[PDB]
Ligand binder design. Structure first.
Ligand SMILES: [Mg+2]
Ligand SMILES: [Mg+2]
Ligand SMILES: [Mg+2]
Ligand SMILES: [Mg+2]
Ligand SMILES: [Mg+2]
Ligand SMILES: [Mg+2]
Ligand SMILES: [Mg+2]
Ligand SMILES: [Mg+2]
Ligand SMILES: [Mg+2]
Ligand SMILES: [Mg+2]
Ligand SMILES: [Mg+2]
Ligand SMILES: [Mg+2]
Ligand SMILES: [Mg+2]
Ligand SMILES: [Mg+2]
Ligand SMILES: [Zn+2]
Ligand SMILES: [Zn+2]
Lengths: 91, 69, 135, 114
RNA sequence: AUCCGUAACUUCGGGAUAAGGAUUGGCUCUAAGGGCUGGCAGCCGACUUAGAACUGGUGCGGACCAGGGGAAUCCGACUGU
RNA sequence: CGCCGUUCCGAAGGGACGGGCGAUGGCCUCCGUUGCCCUCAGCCGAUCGAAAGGGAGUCGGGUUCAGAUCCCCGAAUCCGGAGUGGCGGAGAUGGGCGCCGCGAGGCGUCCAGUGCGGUAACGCGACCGAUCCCGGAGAAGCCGGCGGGAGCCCCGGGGAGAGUUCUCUUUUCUUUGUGAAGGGCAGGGCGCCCUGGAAUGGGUUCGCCCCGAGAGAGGGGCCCGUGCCUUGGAAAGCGUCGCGGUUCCGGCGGCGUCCGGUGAGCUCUCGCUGGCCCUUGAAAAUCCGGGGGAGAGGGUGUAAAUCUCGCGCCGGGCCGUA
């Protein structure tokens, strides 16, 4: 059964810290505790070990990722930019 | 302590230069021959009372013997 | 098509002889009642001949050129096949699957592969076979 | 019920003061101080989470008085690297060395044409 | 402790043991909740819950243990010092 | 007076496998030791710093007015040493050819022999090897759930002693052992192996969670086994009854130390799995394995080098301890 209407994971904090801060931290709490599909082995096991450190329990690979998400939008953009500059550099 | 299974191995143990004595212990179910060597007390457990007497004669001459009670 | 044939050089992947190079003597792709899986009888170099150089004397070269061989039956999954083939004629009357019954025949089987390998080693042919894999 | 005391002057419950209860021929409970739990070796591959097999799990200074057979496995790298990663290194070493011959041959052929 | 019941307001998490009621002993029973061996049979068992009769000068969380409550105003968000 | 500084403005190594030149000795055969030269050489920081951290290895019984894991009895174990360090075992002892013999085998030559088993996980009593290199252990937080083993508690019976008994109570109370180390076997755990190939998906936990990167199902392997059995070891300890003495004797005897059940119970421990962190929860001494293959060992025996195997030999000083 649905146990809360809107707090969800930030129901652990009760009434404290304010609705907007709890609303903000809810987005991060879901993402930083999610299990992502590993791109090396395909199993949904990519889990955060520390801030910025993501580890897959199946293939044992470790990845330098984002603080709360597996990869950041900034890092994804930079990889494409570095890929494009590499082609032009050697044509 | 080490436990000896066969009579031959006990006799070899009883003839060792470091063997110091042999104790005979008589129980209700077995007779135990224990030879005090340098490191271990070796024990032969015999369930046949007849074999115990045959073995008791076969012990080396010089080796001191004690019957426990 | 099929390639696990006699003379094929294979790498032992599992067991006491992992990383040793061997040669298929007899291949059984369909298995048997004793070994339902696919297996081959192989002969292999337990100990490789040592490196020899012109600075070494005749008697030292002969000492370093002695090979210790092994004879084994292997599951196909425990072998890595290679593109190399090695055509030493190994007497099959002595090197066969019946040598695993008594060590007297197994000693002859290993003696047979020892002599044939050493003779083939000294010719300089099949150099890759007689070089240890460095992994 | 009988209540226990330490048999040494370390009155504190530290990692080196662990005990187990033992009944004696005198029919009493005393403390026996246990030895720390030893660990089997970790594979040198740095990848496999499990520990190795065929090796005694003892404190590191106990290995000195064990025979060699108790501290390794009859296999290349045995007792230091897992079986799974020894199979991988054999294939990797062989397969990579073949590609060097493949790449070298193409380079020689290209130079031959050039 | 069990059973019922619970408002304003709210950051929807609370407020909340909100507030407000009823019950509680002893004794004799009933039902349900399992394991082992070979839709059944036999043999073992662990405390629980619910229900009913009877019963005492309405006494029963009998000692001990154990929140008074509500409506508001000021200040500081809170926990912490 | 000194202070800063601890790798920073430093010619910071007094070591070594091995090789070559000598000198001395001895179980004078030849080996040690020793001097020089050659060769090789990161550690990169003296030293101090914990009676709760790291750190090999000792337990049971008895004993005093006062000490005992220290004394005595018994049973062990670690470290170091001995090559005059001894004995076994391993290395080790095979095959071809030629003679002799009916054969068993015996002689002569020529070759091999730094072990062997398993498909595998890995196993076996050892099972050569240096500079160098890689790795492991020491060595890792807090919290939750669950499971295994113990001690304790509880329940049903047998004993032995005691209490109550005006009435009742086959009753109530007490007590009813087995050390370390070795061997074996339960039990627990495995992200270990082999066959095979799975959707009508299945397996599975309190929760989870797992699978074509190989699930179920079969058959194996390994680690811990503090549990039980066995040697220890009944000889001891305890209970009870009965005898002795100088009677201040480890005094001597009989009997007993037995059979089952149960639990989200409490304590300890081992293990599995999860959660939390903008917190990620020591270092070192010390020990080990592996990779490599410089070398050494004997020429078929009187076998050698060598051995982390089994025995055996010697030693462990100093300070604390009521
Ligand atoms: Mg300490
Ligand atoms: Mg025990
Ligand atoms: Mg082993
Ligand atoms: Mg209120
Ligand atoms: Mg106001
Ligand atoms: Mg305040
Ligand atoms: Mg303060
Ligand atoms: Mg110091
Ligand atoms: Mg200290
Ligand atoms: Mg002592
Ligand atoms: Mg399976
Ligand atoms: Mg007795
Ligand atoms: Mg090697
Ligand atoms: Mg004291
Ligand atoms: Zn992965
Ligand atoms: Zn690995």
């Amino acid at each position: 059964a649905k146990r809360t209407k809107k707090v969800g994971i930030v129901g652990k904090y009760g009434t404290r810290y304010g609705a907007s801060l709890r609303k903000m931290v809810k987005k991060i709490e879901i993402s930083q505790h999610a299990k992502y599909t590993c791109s090396f082995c395909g199993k949904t096991k990519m889990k955060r070990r520390a801030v910025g450190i993501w580890h897959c329990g199946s293939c044992m690979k470790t990845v330098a990722g984002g603080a709360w998400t597996y990869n950041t939008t900034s890092a994804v953009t930079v990889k494409s930019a570095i890929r494009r500059l590499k082609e032009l550099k050697d044509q | 302590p080490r436990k000896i299974e066969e009579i031959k191995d006990f006799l070899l143990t009883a003839r060792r230069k470091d063997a110091k004595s042999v104790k005979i212990k008589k129980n209700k179910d077995n007779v135990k021959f224990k030879v005090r060597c340098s490191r271990y007390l070796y024990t032969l457990v015999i369930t046949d009372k007849e074999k115990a007497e045959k073995l008791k004669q076969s012990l080396p001459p010089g080796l001191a013997v004690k019957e426990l009670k | 098509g099929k390639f696990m044939k006699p003379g094929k050089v294979v790498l032992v992947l599992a067991g006491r002889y992992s990383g040793r190079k061997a040669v298929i003597v007899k291949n059984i792709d369909d298995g048997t009642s004793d070994r339902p899986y696919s297996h081959a009888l192989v002969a292999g170099i337990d100990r490789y001949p040592r490196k020899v150089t012109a600075a070494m004397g005749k008697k030292k070269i002969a000492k370093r050129s002695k090979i210790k061989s092994f004879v084994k039956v292997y599951n196909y999954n425990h072998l890595m096949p290679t593109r190399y083939s090695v055509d030493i004629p190994l007497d099959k009357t002595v090197v066969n699957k019946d040598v695993f019954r008594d060590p007297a025949l197994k000693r002859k089987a290993r003696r047979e592969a020892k002599v044939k390998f050493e003779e083939r080693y000294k010719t300089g042919k099949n150099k890759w076979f007689f070089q240890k894999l460095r992994f | 019920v009988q209540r226990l005391t330490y048999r040494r002057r370390l009155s504190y419950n530290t990692a080196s003061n662990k005990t187990r209860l033992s009944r004696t021929p005198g029919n009493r409970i005393v403390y026996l101080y246990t030895k720390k739990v030893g660990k089997a070796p970790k594979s040198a591959c740095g990848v496999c989470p499990g520990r190795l097999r065929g090796v005694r799990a003892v404190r590191p200074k106990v290995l000195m008085r064990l025979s060699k057979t108790k501290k390794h496995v009859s296999r290349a790298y045995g007792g230091s690297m897992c079986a799974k990663c020894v199979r991988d290194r054999i294939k990797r070493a062989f397969l990579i060395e073949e590609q060097k011959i493949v790449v070298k041959v193409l380079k020689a052929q290209a130079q031959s044409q050039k």
